[PDB]
């Protein structure tokens, strides 16, 4: 590698990507709701209900930051979590949050990939193993992540706009080992949570061309007793 854009660069996983990639002396841009002071450059997204407003603004700012330079990878690691079934009084607000944090971010990242990824470069998208099935207790989350899985399939297709030789791969974890999760779920089996450094080192391998899955892959990331395995799922 040499240039990476981390979409979600201030989140738990995205902050670790910024740190690790800067430690390798890569140029790293963060796109998030606030800067990442560790990144080479930061782009700050507008809070708005207008998807086109937010998407046009980020696209313009990224285009000005990069100019004609292309990037080796876009790691779209944004996403949150908010729960609730279809009867919940919080359903509509939580769905709006989930669509903004997963659908909007993935879509903008995909467009940026067509415009700015080098030939042979990498786009990662943040899916969820749970959205391979019904998610009755987390309606918005499941819909958003299911949309991202489908988008990954589209990007692998002919004439999607992805550059020659580039790959879009979705990552489908269960739970990541993060400080916020350890304090939110202090009785869980952390040894079934995926270490952030496992994903950072996987991304580094994929960006550099080591053991890179085919475009359109849905890669399940499952940690069992501290050991993480990668398993393809098929849409």
């Amino acid at each position: 590698a040499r240039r990476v854009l981390v979409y979600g660069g201030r989140g738990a996983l995205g902050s670790r990507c910024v740190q690790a990639f800067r430690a390798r002396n890569w140029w790293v841009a963060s796109v998030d709701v606030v800067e990442n002071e560790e990144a080479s450059a930061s782009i700050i997204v507008k809070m708005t209900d207008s998807f086109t407003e937010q998407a046009d603004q980020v696209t313009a700012e990224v285009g000005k930051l990069l100019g004609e330079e292309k990037v080796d990878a876009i790691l779209c690691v944004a996403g949150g979590w908010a729960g609730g079934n279809a009867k919940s009084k919080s359903l509509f607000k939580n769905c709006d949050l989930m669509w903004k944090q997963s659908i909007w971010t993935s879509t903008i990242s995909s467009h940026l990939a067509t415009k700015h990824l080098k030939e042979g470069g990498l786009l990662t998208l943040a899916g969820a193993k749970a959205a391979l099935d019904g998610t009755p207790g987390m309606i918005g989350y499941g819909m958003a992540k299911g949309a991202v899985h489908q988008l990954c399939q589209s990007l692998a297709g002919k004439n999607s706009g992805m550059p020659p030789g580039a790959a879009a791969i979705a990552v489908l974890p269960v739970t990541l080992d993060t400080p916020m999760n350890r304090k939110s779920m202090p009785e869980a089996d952390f040894s079934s949570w995926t270490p952030l450094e496992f994903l950072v080192e996987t991304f580094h391998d994929w960006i550099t061309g080591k053991n890179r899955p085919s475009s359109g892959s849905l890669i399940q990331v499952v940690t069992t007793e501290g050991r993480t395995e990668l398993t393809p799922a098929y849409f």
């Binding site: 606030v34 800067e35 002071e37 930061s42 700050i44 700012e61 916020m180």
Partner: protein, 107 residues
């Protein structure tokens, strides 16, 4: 980080908890007093949940100190706000922000 100054006191006993939703009206200004946004201009309060990384650190620490009905001035250093980069087009680089916040209720 964040300085909290009381404009008018709250009930002095209902303070937010993690998991509760704070309902507020605010006006945000630059250090020179130039207004950049107000929820009052929309006649609609801003809502956020503490403990969920939903807001700049100065609000996360500042609003947690307020009781229901309090009106407070939060003066927030850049490292507790938008930092060196700022938010181009609305918040300048390394900006100290001042927010007038009224904690209307907890939901």
């Amino acid at each position: 980080g964040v300085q909290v100054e009381t404009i008018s006191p709250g009930d002095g006993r209902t303070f937010p908890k993690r998991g509760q939703t704070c309902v507020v009206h605010y006006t945000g200004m630059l250090e020179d007093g130039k207004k950049f946004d107000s929820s009052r201009d929309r006649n609609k309060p801003f809502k956020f949940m503490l403990g969920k990384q939903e807001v700049i650190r100065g609000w996360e620490e500042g609003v947690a100190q307020m009781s229901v009905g309090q009106r407070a001035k939060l003066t927030i250093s850049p490292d507790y706000a938008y930092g060196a980069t700022g938010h181009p087009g609305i918040i300048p680089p390394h900006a100290t922000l001042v927010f007038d916040v009224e904690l209307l209720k907890l939901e």
